[PDB]
DNA sequence: CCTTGCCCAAACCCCACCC
DNA sequence: GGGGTGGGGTTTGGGCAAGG
């Protein structure tokens, strides 16, 4: 129908149904490799991209042994969760 | 009626001939207007609404003459096949 | 039975926002 | 040579049964 909170009008009731979970916060989608979830399933293949592509050098972190593709990534992660021992 | 695949019992064996197809990977219903085809004609008649309707504005490939309903579907396509 | 249209989740993609 | 996420949107695949 329509956005019973914001009043918005979809075309679609599939995307009324993802703009309600960015309403309520509702991440079902979550990763099997950290703690990260999102309210579409693309969004998840996007972010599972950053955990190394196929073919590609992969940076596995120190503490925690998480994939990552990226060298950049893989510091941000360590300075946002491995700060505990510094 | 029962898939020799995956063992789905039907209520309908039509719907098990669809299903199927899913299996077999076969697509009998082919789009005339590009490369789409599907298992269903009820979807190859969904996809063709894409392409316009009559009585509404159409946008056509300036390349291929590919007629579109949606403007965004236009300038995705002009993405995936020209690069030039 | 067979058509067909609807419902919903899922795919793909573009653009804007963030750290 | 930035890399990744959130919002937004078209389109598509699988399913299902009411009504031809
Ligand atoms: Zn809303
Ligand atoms: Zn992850
Ligand atoms: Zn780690
Ligand atoms: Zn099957
Ligand atoms: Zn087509
Ligand atoms: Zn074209």
Same mark, same amino acid.
């Given at each position: 129908d329509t956005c019973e909170?914001?009043?918005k009008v979809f075309k679609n009731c599939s995307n009324l149904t993802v703009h309600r979970r960015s309403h309520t916060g509702e991440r079902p989608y979550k990763c099997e490799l950290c703690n990260y979830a999102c309210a579409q399933s693309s969004?998840?293949?996007r972010? *599972? !991209?950053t955990?190394?592509?196929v073919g590609k050098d992969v940076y596995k972190c120190?503490?925690?042994?998480m994939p990552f593709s990226?060298?950049?990534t893989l510091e941000k992660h *360590? !300075?946002?969760w491995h700060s505990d021992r510094v």
């Open positions: 909170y914001c009043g969004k998840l293949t972010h *599972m !991209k955990h190394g592509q120190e503490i925690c042994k990226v060298y950049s *360590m !300075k946002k």
